Every structure is written in structure tokens, then in C-alpha cells.
Design a protein around this motif. Structure first.
Motif, PDB file in Angstrom:
ATOM      1  N   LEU B  48      28.745   0.997 -10.066  1.00 41.25           N
ATOM      2  CA  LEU B  48      29.001   1.276 -11.572  1.00 41.25           C
ATOM      3  C   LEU B  48      28.522   2.906 -11.437  1.00 41.25           C
ATOM      4  CD1 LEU B  48      27.150  -1.712 -12.844  1.00 41.25           C
ATOM      5  CD2 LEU B  48      28.822  -0.433 -13.901  1.00 41.25           C
ATOM      6  N   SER B  49      29.059   3.307 -12.395  1.00 43.69           N
ATOM      7  CA  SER B  49      29.037   4.864 -12.603  1.00 43.69           C
ATOM      8  C   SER B  49      27.527   5.366 -13.121  1.00 43.69           C
ATOM      9  CB  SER B  49      30.080   5.428 -13.427  1.00 43.69           C
ATOM     10  OG  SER B  49      31.140   4.829 -13.172  1.00 43.69           O
ATOM     11  N   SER B  50      27.217   6.699 -13.167  1.00 42.56           N
ATOM     12  CA  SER B  50      26.096   7.274 -14.025  1.00 42.56           C
ATOM     13  C   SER B  50      26.035   7.145 -15.397  1.00 42.56           C
ATOM     14  CB  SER B  50      25.477   8.266 -13.354  1.00 42.56           C
ATOM     15  OG  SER B  50      26.068   9.447 -13.880  1.00 42.56           O
ATOM     16  N   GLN B  51      27.604   7.213 -15.864  1.00 42.46           N
ATOM     17  CA  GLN B  51      27.490   7.090 -17.161  1.00 42.46           C
ATOM     18  C   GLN B  51      27.363   5.781 -17.776  1.00 42.46           C
ATOM     19  OE1 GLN B  51      30.517   8.094 -15.296  1.00 42.46           O
ATOM     20  NE2 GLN B  51      29.547  10.523 -15.053  1.00 42.46           N
TER      21      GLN B  51
END
Lengths: 60, 59, 101, 28, 128, 662, 94
Positions: B48-51
Motif C-alpha cells: 500500500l501507498s503512503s497516501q
RNA sequence: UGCGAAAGCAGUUGAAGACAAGUGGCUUGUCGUUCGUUAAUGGCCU
């Protein structure tokens, strides 16, 4: 005086007037020629930004 | 696999991936079943992204 | 009928509000200036009603700022006043020949 | 006066930025 | 003047029906708008006028309906946010008290057409 | 009274679009960040800012250009052991090399063919390519020493203008042209095919308009050329065999600038459709198959991206990008899509353009080659000076009592008497040829008549004559970055001044004896200096956001506990405090401000206890009040004992990439 | 507007003939359909003019709270005599 | 949610447990947990 202020401004600022067959150009100064790079060619700068603001990319 | 959320198997049926829910969050593990060719696993927070951690649960 | 059918397709299909979101004074004046003409007809006036209602729902502050669509809203008000006098007197004729059955 | 009352009631039924220079205050 | 008397009476703690009566006493349109513009909060003027217009949706006085329509014009950014426990059933029973006039505007316009036809043919046949 | 605040939005000082980013040192991932790394930002009004990415990007120097001057490309040159050298093209027929000390051109080499469209620097940095409008590629011999530039060789000509250049190595030079083609010349001296164009490649043309190849880079880990053109397509070409490997249809409009990291695992690219695309080859299968993938895509900029560059070291890995909207954007290189980003303020006024005078309640402000003056009342514009005998402006100061203004640029300065004639002013030049001949950086008004002048060649005069100034030890960073030992700041009131040079040297000076008494005592670049007449103190603040004060005739106990009792706002601050002054009603409280906040520290109190250059790399060597509700900030000052002057900024077509509608 | 003056007079005067006709609606269907479609949408434009007039007098009274202020608010200016004292080349000239 | 007509007429909105963040507790918020209640600039083919 309202309709010729830019006329007398440019006609006193500009140089290299005609004298019959001849044309008497001023040489510039080492002051300006060594404090600044010469001006941009507005032809090519207008070409590049007119390209990047062409109509085919719909800016808004 | 002691807790499964979601699963899929490859087209040849040679390996299968699934999800885990093993703690802070879920996890993702792939395993070849007709041989011990490969079996790996990782928490999906590294997928998963950091956003997405400051966004909705759909992300 | 083509303006009416694209209004009706945007009404049924998605969102009047989506079609009206990014607008301001200069880009709403076509809509309201057509709504003046469309409020007279029977076939358009339901769609004209809900489109004008949505645009004054979500542009009530541009109403305050720009004076040059205030006058368009006032002209629309007198248009709906004429049309509501017409739609009232049609009901009166409807009753006055319902009396003659 | 009945059509007037009925019209008004039905109206009730269907009825149901920065300047260039300010001057303000803050804590000492 | 008497608008200020009604303002002070309705602002102190009490006398809301008498306050609407004193508002109906002078009863200016400009001062009617000014009394909405001045006050910063209401002591459930919407609730008492809700019960008044619910108990009389057919009154010949235009005072309390004029007050309600100007209150809803000028302050409805806050009437939907002052209170939503009794005010919900308040607007519900007000909306159901007032929808019947929308139900019966066509029959009243029909009877108006009837009566205009009758009176105009009676003015017509006037025996020379 | 309580503090009454004049939130002014009158000054419309607007910078220009970033057209060229460059980094001084190349990347070298497995070694520490050098202490000499500078980012250079050439705008479109012709000024070159030089920023240092240590501790959240302070701005060291600014090199302004004048009327009708722009700057389109710029390249660094640092041969190991010699000074940094900065060349730049404008829209003209010359290359301009700048000496970093004065902030002037030290060389205007007219390239001998046409109007320059692009510039690139050789690998090993002894030669310079300029690609010109008449289809020429001209080589300029750089290795003769700093300043001396020779013509070398005009490469084999062509029809269309060459819009971008790159070098393979010392050997080949690649150039994208405005006819949709990409030529490859050989600049390898002492070969048989020297100068002639070896290959030509043609990109997939647009159907209904001409195609221009806008950006070309060489990728040394593989053997490819990456190229972005005006269809939005990005193509990767095998260098040997001179032919395409794969084309991506990435952007929606032109791709103005593209760059890569050190080991060429990523290629970043951007253009007028304002997204930054990332093309990755990091997988072992990608590296053994030579297959880039279109990995990611980010929307961060507002209007365009005209310049992109990348730096990657042991404690620094960021790509920097800027465009038509005037702000800079920092992203991470190896963590582009995942990680965070920082959009810089459009101006951080390390050099101010606005100052006020408390008498007459008036404020002067100078944009490019014009000054303007207005008074408080509302407000009224009382006078302005659009001096067009001038070409470029720089710093300015007014006399206390508001009598004489002095404007001053690095070529000359000029002093104007002012007389308030009512609802207008009358302004008259007062002639002084010493001022007309001197170069001025700072003028700061000892008296109503006496000013102190800091010259661009490190002279400190006192006019209306000479301060003795000791010399500094020239170390390796001082010989590398050749403006570190130059006087940044000087602050004065009542016959006692203090100057500051960015090596970490802050030296007082008595205006009577004109002797130094140095108090250098510092570790890095000094952001601001303000003198407190109470406590007999100097107040320096450095780039690390620490407040030191020292006495005069070393740091006080208030400094000694304040520095490590400093608030969490200062410890998490991102924008450096560019201005300090003292309060007017109290002579001991001081009131300071950065570009996005306003703070005030109290002289006696102490409070209790309980995307940067972050490595172990050195610096350039080898009641408390805090607010931020006036954050697009340009300048603040005081007028009288209760009011405050907060002058800020306030706001163009762009490629519409629409937000989702519902 | 103008023609229904004719249709109300035809009903009033000939009120016996077309009450003795056996199929009134079948014989003048087009009148019934026209008036039904004219008067069917009356609640809709009732709601329209309620919602329209509300916002109209809302901005009218809010702008009548300050209707005198915009009569002398514009105090704008231009490139005044500061430009003449500004032109430094024209200050060396005249 | 129930009864209804397309209007409307009656009813609301609890508990447990786990986890996350903030400052072992305390606060707030979640749940591919249980019990009870009639209740991510991301758009459509040749």
C-alpha cells in the motif's frame, strides 16, 4: 502633449539617424555590455511560448 | 492457513495467493501447491501507498 | 427540441449539479437567457423549473455579487408571473366548461 | 382570499471573498 | 416604538403570543424585516408560529404568515440548525398542515371560473 | 492598546517562471553529500537564485538580470580542484559565464552561429555544446581556466533548430531538433568522423501539427537515449544501432524536461500537461531484459513543469521540479510515488523588496526597475519612480524622517530627494558621481546624511569613507563555492554596524575607529542579523534555526538557555526567519518573521523542558508568541507602539486535468 | 392571452347549445387537452416562483441594507503625475 | 423501518469486544467482530 509624449520619448531616446546616403550609428557602452547579458530574441521566445500555448492544447 | 480473507489461484493452477489478517493489519501470502517451488509472504502495508493511510477505507 | 433533449439527458442521466459546478457569471447567462424563452412553452417548463431551481440553489452568492444576472433573475420572475397567470386562467376555463357537462 | 391563502400555503409547502486591505487585532 | 416594545418583550423571557400580537399591532413590512435583522437569536419563534399556523392554516390575517415567510427568507441558514428534535416534527406537522392548500388550489380556481361565467352571463342577460 | 494589524495586500511583486534547474555536483550515491552542492534556479525574468539544500533549502545568493533579459538553460562546471563555474544562455547569441563572487557576468562569449536554444556540458566538463537556431551545434572549449572560453568546432550543420542537447561521454553528442528528429553527432576529436552527424532518428509525428523533440538525455547504465517530444510520447533508443527499443504514450501534451537517477533505474519526465511520470527498470528481470515499465504518475504542479533535475547521494535523494507556476517542488527519487513532497513558497524573501518608515506612515517597494511609495491613513499611493534609464534594480533604503531614497544595483546607485507636496510627492535626483560609479549591495543609513555602503567587490564605504576589514582564511569550500566569504548582511543604527558573511562569520564594526573586533563564532550560513541596543547585543540566526545573541563593547546566558529551551515551533520550522526587528514600545522585546509566519520572543523568559540534506555531512566548511495566519508573507514591520505592517502577496491559463466531477 | 377572451365568450353566450350537444369533450377535445396541459404544471411553477422570489428579495434586502454605499465607493485612480516625476530619462530631459 | 395511494401516517439512532491515533490509564475514531432493535487525476473499443 498627451498624443505625442511617446513620440518625443522615442525620438529623443533612439539613435542612428540618417544623413543623406549615410547613417550615423552610436556605439554602446562597456557599462551595459559588462553589467548584463544581452536581451532575449523576442522572435524565438515568442515562438517557444506561443507553441506551449497553442490552441491544440486546450488551456484554461 | 488459519485466517483467510481473499484468495486466488493462477491459471495453470500451479500456485495460489491469499490474505491473512495476522498482526497490525492483514497480510498477503503466495504459495506453490504442487511443489515447494516458492512460498513467500509479506504484510500488505509494504504494498500500500503512503497516501492511502490518511484516506478512506476504500483506498 | 435539441436544447431540451440535452437538458433532459443531463437531468435523467447524471447530475444537473455536475453540469453546473464550475460556472460563474459569464458562463451561466446562456442557460438563464435560454430559460427565459423556455419558460413560456409547456414542454420545456418542467425542465426549466428544476434547472433554474438548482442554479439558484448553488449560485446564491453570485446573485449577490454580480448585478448583471440579478436583472436576469428579475426578468425570469416576471416571466414566471405571466406564466402563472396563464396557468391559473387555464384552470379557470377548465372549470367553466366542467360546469357545462 | 381562499386562492390567496392556498397560494401562500403551497409556497410554504414547496419552501420546505477577500479584500485588499484589512485591519485586525491579535494577542499582546 | 411599538416595534421596540415588541422586541423588548419578545427578547426578555416571555409573552411570545402577546409579542406576535404587538408585532401585528404596528405591522410594517420594513419594520417587519428590521425585527428579523436586529435579533441575534430566537426563543423558538419558529415553534410558536409553527403551532399558530398549524392551528390556523386558513386565517384572513396575513401577519403571522408574512412573519413566517420573511423569517424563512432571511434566517433559514439557522432555522435548520438551531434545533432538530422537536423542530423536526414541528416542520413535519407544519408541512402537512400546509400541503392541503396545494391539494385544493385547482378546485378553487375551477369554482372561480364557474362564478365568473355565471356572473358574466347574468350581466349579459340584463333584459335590455 | 492591543496590537492593531495592517494586513496589506498592495505589493504585487511577482516572480517569474522557473526555466532551468541544475545541481552543482553530480550524484555519486555511495559517497557523502559534498559541502559544495548548490542548486541553481534560473527564472524567466532573468535572475538566477542559488539555493543550498542543507536544512530545508536556504537561499544563499541571487544574481538578477534586467529589462528584457531571460535565461533558458544553465549548466555547472566543476573540474576537481578548481572553482565552480556557471554558464547560462539567454534568448540570445551569447553564452554568459558568471563569477559567483560579485553576481555579475564575467564573460559574454558570443557563440559564432545564431541564437542559442540549448546548452549542455561535457562529461569531464572541458567542452560545452550550444545548440542554435540555425541548426548548428557549436563546441566551446571550456578548459582554459575560469573565464576564458574558446571556440572549438562547429559540428555538421542541418536545417532545423536543435532544441535540446546531451552528451554520451566525452565522445558523442545527441541532439533533439524541431523537425521531429534526433540527430547523433560525434564530438570525438582525432577520429575520422569528427563533427559529422552519425545517425538520425525520427519520432512518431503528430497527425495535425508539427512535432518537436523537446528533451533528450543519455542513460549510461544501459546504452540508451531517452527522449520526450511534443506529442507527449517518451521513447527509449538503443544508442548503438541508433534505433527505438520502446515507446510510451505517456503525457497528453509536450514533454518539456526529463531526467534520470544515478544508476538509471528510474527516468522522470514532465511537461505542459503538468504531471510527472516515472519510468522504472528496477527489477532484476527489467535490468536483464532492458525493459522499462511506466511505473507511476503524479499531479503536483499547478500550471507547467519547465525544469526537472535530480540529485542522489548518501544523505540526499530528491528530484526538484519547477514550471510556469513560480514555485519549486521537491520529491524523493527512489520513493517518488510512495513518499512525500514539499511545495516551496513562491518567494522566501532572503533579499527584501519592501520597507516602511514610521514617520509619514509610508512604505516603499521595488519590483524590477520601478519603485512605489504609499502611505497609510486606508492607503494612498503618493509617488513612484519608474526609472527606465535603469535596467535592473536591487536593494534600497530610505532616510529616517523620510527625506532621501537611495536605490542601488550592482552597477550603480542613485539618490533622490523627496518632498511631500500634499497628495503627491516631488522627487529630484541629487548628483554624486561617487555613488554613480560605485557598486552597491547594501545601504543602511548611519544618520540622516551618513550611509554605509557594501560594495559587490567587498568594500565598505561611509559616505555623506573606508572601514578596515580583516581577511578570512581561504579553505577548500571557500575556494570551491566562490561567494562564501562575501558580506551578506550589514545592520546599523547609531554609529555601530555589524556585517555578516556566510562562512559563519559575523563581524561588528565601530563606525568611529573603523576597526573590526571580530566575533566569528559560528558553524554555518547566517540567515539574519539584528542589533539590540538594549543588552548591547547582536542577534544572529543561522540556517539551522537557532537564535544566538552576543554582547558588544561571548554569548549571553539568555542565549545559553534559550537555544536548547527553544520552542517546538522553531524546532519543526520549515521556512527560515529572514527578518528580525525590535519592538517599538519596549526596547528589549524582539519581533521576527519568516516567509510563512510571525513570531516574537521575550527577552528574559525561558520555557521549561519536560526531504533535506540529512547525513553526517558538514556545513559549508569541508511571553513567547507564534502565529502563521498571514502565511503568504512578504514583509512585516512596525509603525508605532501598537500597530503592525504585514504586507503579503495575492494572485493564468493551465492544462485542464479535471477533478472528478461529483 | 388574447385568444382565450374569445373562448370564454363562446361558452358564456352559447351556454345552451354546447350543453345540449351529447359529447362535449369528444367534440372539443383539443380545448380540453390544451387547457389540461396548460394548467397541469401549475404546482411546478408555483414552487419555481416561490424559490426564485425568495432568493430575489433575499439579495434585494441584503443589497438594500447597503444600497447607498456603492454610489461613491469607486475612488479608483491611474498613472498620475508620479509617472511624470517617475520617468527619470524624461526627468533628465524635462 | 411498518402501514400505505402516487399524498401521507406511527417508530428511531443501543450494548459488548478488538484495533488505530493522540495525550498502564484517559479521550477520539474505526471494524472483510458479536449480540439486540420491525429499523489514489481516477470514466466506455475498433
Amino acid at each position: 502633449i498627451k498624443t505625442k509624449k511617446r513620440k518625443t520619448l522615442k525620438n529623443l531616446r533612439k539613435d542612428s539617424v540618417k544623413r543623406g546616403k549615410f547613417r550615423v550609428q552610436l556605439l554602446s557602452t562597456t557599462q551595459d555590455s559588462k553589467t548584463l547579458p544581452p536581451k532575449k530574441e523576442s522572435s524565438i521566445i515568442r515562438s517557444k511560448d506561443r507553441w506551449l500555448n497553442r490552441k491544440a492544447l486546450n488551456k484554461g | 492457513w488459519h485466517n483467510v480473507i481473499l484468495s486466488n489461484i493462477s491459471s495453470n493452477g500451479k500456485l495460489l495467493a491469499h490474505m491473512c489478517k495476522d498482526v497490525e493489519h492483514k497480510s498477503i501470502s503466495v504459495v506453490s501447491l504442487f511443489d515447494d517451488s516458492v512460498n513467500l509472504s509479506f504484510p500488505l502495508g509494504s504494498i500500500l501507498s503512503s497516501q492511502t493511510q490518511s484516506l478512506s477505507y476504500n483506498t | 427540441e435539441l436544447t431540451l433533449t440535452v437538458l433532459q439527458e443531463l437531468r435523467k442521466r447524471g447530475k444537473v449539479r455536475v453540469a453546473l459546478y464550475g460556472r460563474d457569471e459569464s458562463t451561466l447567462e446562456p442557460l438563464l437567457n435560454w430559460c427565459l424563452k423556455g419558460i413560456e412553452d409547456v414542454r420545456s417548463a418542467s425542465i426549466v423549473a428544476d434547472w433554474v431551481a438548482v442554479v439558484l440553489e448553488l449560485y446564491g452568492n453570485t446573485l449577490e455579487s454580480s448585478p448583471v444576472l440579478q436583472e436576469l433573475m428579475i426578468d425570469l420572475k416576471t416571466k414566471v408571473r405571466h406564466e402563472i397567470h396563464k396557468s391559473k386562467e387555464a384552470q379557470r376555463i377548465e372549470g367553466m366548461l366542467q360546469l357545462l357537462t | 382570499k381562499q386562492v390567496e391563502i392556498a397560494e401562500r400555503n403551497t409556497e410554504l409547502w414547496n419552501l420546505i471573498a477577500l479584500p485588499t486591505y484589512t485591519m485586525e487585532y491579535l494577542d499582546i | 416604538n411599538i416595534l421596540s416594545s415588541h422586541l423588548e418583550a419578545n427578547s426578555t423571557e416571555i409573552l411570545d403570543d402577546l409579542m406576535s400580537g404587538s408585532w401585528t399591532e404596528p405591522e410594517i413590512k420594513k419594520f417587519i424585516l428590521t425585527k428579523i435583522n436586529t435579533v441575534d437569536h430566537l426563543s423558538k419563534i419558529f415553534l410558536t408560529i409553527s403551532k399558530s399556523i398549524t392551528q390556523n392554516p386558513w386565517n384572513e390575517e396575513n401577519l403571522l404568515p408574512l412573519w413566517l415567510k420573511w423569517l424563512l427568507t432571511l434566517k433559514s441558514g439557522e432555522l435548520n440548525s438551531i434545533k432538530d428534535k422537536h423542530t423536526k416534527k414541528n416542520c413535519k406537522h407544519l408541512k402537512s398542515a400546509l400541503r392541503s392548500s396545494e391539494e385544493i388550489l385547482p378546485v378553487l380556481l375551477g369554482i372561480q371560473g364557474r362564478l365568473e361565467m355565471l356572473r358574466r352571463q347574468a350581466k349579459l342577460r340584463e333584459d335590455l | 492598546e492591543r496590537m492593531i494589524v495592517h494586513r496589506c495586500r498592495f505589493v504585487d511583486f511577482t516572480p517569474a517562471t522557473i526555466t532551468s534547474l541544475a545541481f552543482s555536483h553530480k550524484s555519486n550515491i555511495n559517497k557523502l553529500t559534498p559541502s559544495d552542492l548548490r542548486l541553481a534556479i534560473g527564472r524567466s525574468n532573468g535572475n538566477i537564485e542559488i539555493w543550498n539544500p542543507r536544512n530545508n533549502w536556504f537561499q544563499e545568493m541571487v544574481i538578477e538580470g534586467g529589462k528584457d533579459r531571460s535565461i533558458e538553460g544553465l549548466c555547472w562546471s566543476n573540474v576537481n580542484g578548481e572553482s565552480l563555474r556557471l554558464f547560462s544562455i539567454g534568448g540570445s547569441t551569447v553564452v554568459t559565464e558568471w563569477d559567483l563572487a560579485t553576481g555579475l557576468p564575467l564573460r559574454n562569449y558570443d557563440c559564432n552561429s545564431g541564437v542559442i536554444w540549448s546548452i549542455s556540458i561535457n562529461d569531464s566538463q572541458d567542452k560545452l555544446s550550444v545548440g542554435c537556431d540555425n541548426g548548428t551545434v557549436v563546441l566551446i572549449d571550456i578548459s582554459g581556466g575560469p573565464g576564458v572560453l574558446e571556440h572549438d568546432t562547429i559540428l555538421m550543420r542541418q536545417e532545423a533548430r536543435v532544441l535540446t542537447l546531451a552528451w554520451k561521454k566525452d565522445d558523442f553528442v545527441i541532439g533533439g531538433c524541431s523537425d521531429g528528429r534526433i540527430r547523433i553527432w560525434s564530438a570525438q576529436k582525432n577520429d575520422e568522423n569528427m563533427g559529422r552527424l552519425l545517425h538520425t532518428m525520427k519520432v512518431d509525428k503528430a497527425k495535425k501539427e508539427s512535432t518537436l523533440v523537446w528533451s533528450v538525455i543519455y542513460l549510461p547504465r544501459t546504452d540508451q537515449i531517452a527522449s520526450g517530444d511534443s506529442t507527449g510520447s517518451i521513447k527509449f533508443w538503443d544508442f548503438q544501432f541508433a534505433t527505438l527499443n520502446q515507446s510510451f504514450k505517456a503525457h497528453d501534451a509536450d514533454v518539456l524536461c526529463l531526467t534520470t537517477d544515478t544508476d538509471n533505474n528510474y527516468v522522470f519526465s514532465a511537461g505542459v500537461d503538468r504531471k510527472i511520470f516515472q519510468f522504472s527498470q528496477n527489477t532484476n528481470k527489467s535490468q536483464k531484459n532492458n525493459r522499462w515499465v511506466n511505473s507511476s504518475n503524479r499531479l503536483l504542479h499547478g500550471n507547467d513543469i519547465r525544469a526537472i533535475c535530480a540529485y542522489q547521494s548518501k544523505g540526499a535523494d530528491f528530484l526538484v521540479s519547477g514550471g510556469v507556476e513560480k514555485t519549486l517542488v521537491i520529491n524523493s527519487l527512489t520513493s517518488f510515488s510512495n513518499g512525500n513532497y514539499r511545495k516551496m513558497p513562491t518567494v522566501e524573501p532572503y533579499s527584501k523588496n519592501v520597507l516602511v518608515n514610521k514617520e509619514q506612515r509610508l512604505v516603499v517597494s521595488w519590483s524590477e526597475s520601478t519603485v512605489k511609495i504609499w502611505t497609510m491613513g486606508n492607503y494612498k499611493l503618493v509617488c513612484k519612480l519608474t526609472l527606465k534609464d535603469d535596467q535592473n534594480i536591487s536593494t534600497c533604503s530610505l532616510s529616517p524622517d523620510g527625506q532621501v531614497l537611495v536605490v542601488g544595483r550592482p552597477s550603480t546607485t542613485k539618490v533622490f530627494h523627496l518632498q511631500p507636496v500634499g497628495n503627491k510627492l516631488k522627487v529630484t535626483k541629487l548628483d554624486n558621481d561617487l555613488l554613480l560609479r560605485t557598486s552597491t549591495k547594501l545601504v543602511k543609513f548611519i544618520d540622516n546624511s551618513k550611509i554605509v555602503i557594501c560594495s559587490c567587490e567587498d568594500d565598505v564605504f561611509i559616505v555623506d569613507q573606508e572601514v578596515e576589514l580583516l581577511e578570512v582564511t581561504s579553505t577548500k569550500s571557500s575556494i570551491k563555492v566562490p561567494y562564501i566569504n562575501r558580506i551578506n548582511h550589514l545592520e546599523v543604527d547609531q554609529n555601530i554596524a555589524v556585517i555578516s558573511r556566510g562562512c559563519g562569520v559575523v563581524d561588528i564594526l565601530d563606525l568611529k575607529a573603523r576597526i573590526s573586533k571580530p566575533l566569528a563564532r559560528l558553524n554555518n550560513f547566517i540567515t539574519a542579523v539584528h542589533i539590540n541596543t538594549s543588552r548591547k547585543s547582536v542577534v544572529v540566526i543561522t540556517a539551522d534555526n537557532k537564535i544566538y545573541e552576543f554582547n558588544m563593547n561571548v554569548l549571553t546566558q539568555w542565549s545559553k538557555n534559550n537555544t536548547d529551551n527553544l520552542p517546538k515551533e522553531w524546532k519543526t520550522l520549515k521556512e527560515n526567519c529572514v527578518g528580525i526587528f525590535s519592538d517599538i514600545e519596549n526596547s528589549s522585546r524582539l519581533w521576527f518573521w519568516g516567509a510563512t509566519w510571525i513570531s516574537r520572543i521575550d527577552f528574559d523568559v525561558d520555557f521549561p523542558i519536560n526531504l533535506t540534506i540529512t547525513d553526517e555531512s558538514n556545513f559549508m566548511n569541508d511571553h513567547f508568541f507564534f502565529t502563521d495566519k498571514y502565511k503568504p508573507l512578504l514583509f512585516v514591520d512596525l509603525i508605532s507602539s501598537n500597530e503592525l505592517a504585514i504586507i503579503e502577496r495575492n494572485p493564468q491559463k493551465a492544462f485542464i486535468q479535471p477533478k472528478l466531477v461529483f | 392571452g388574447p385568444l382565450n377572451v374569445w373562448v370564454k365568450w363562446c361558452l358564456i353566450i352559447h351556454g345552451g347549445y354546447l350543453v345540449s350537444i351529447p359529447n362535449l369533450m369528444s367534440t372539443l377535445s383539443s380545448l380540453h387537452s390544451t387547457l389540461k396541459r396548460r394548467s397541469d404544471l401549475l404546482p411546478r411553477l408555483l414552487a419555481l416562483d416561490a424559490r426564485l422570489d425568495c432568493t430575489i428579495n433575499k439579495f434585494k434586502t441584503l443589497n438594500y441594507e447597503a444600497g447607498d454605499i456603492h454610489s461613491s465607493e469607486p475612488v479608483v485612480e491611474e498613472d498620475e503625475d508620479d509617472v511624470e516625476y517617475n520617468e527619470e530619462l524624461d526627468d533628465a530631459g524635462l
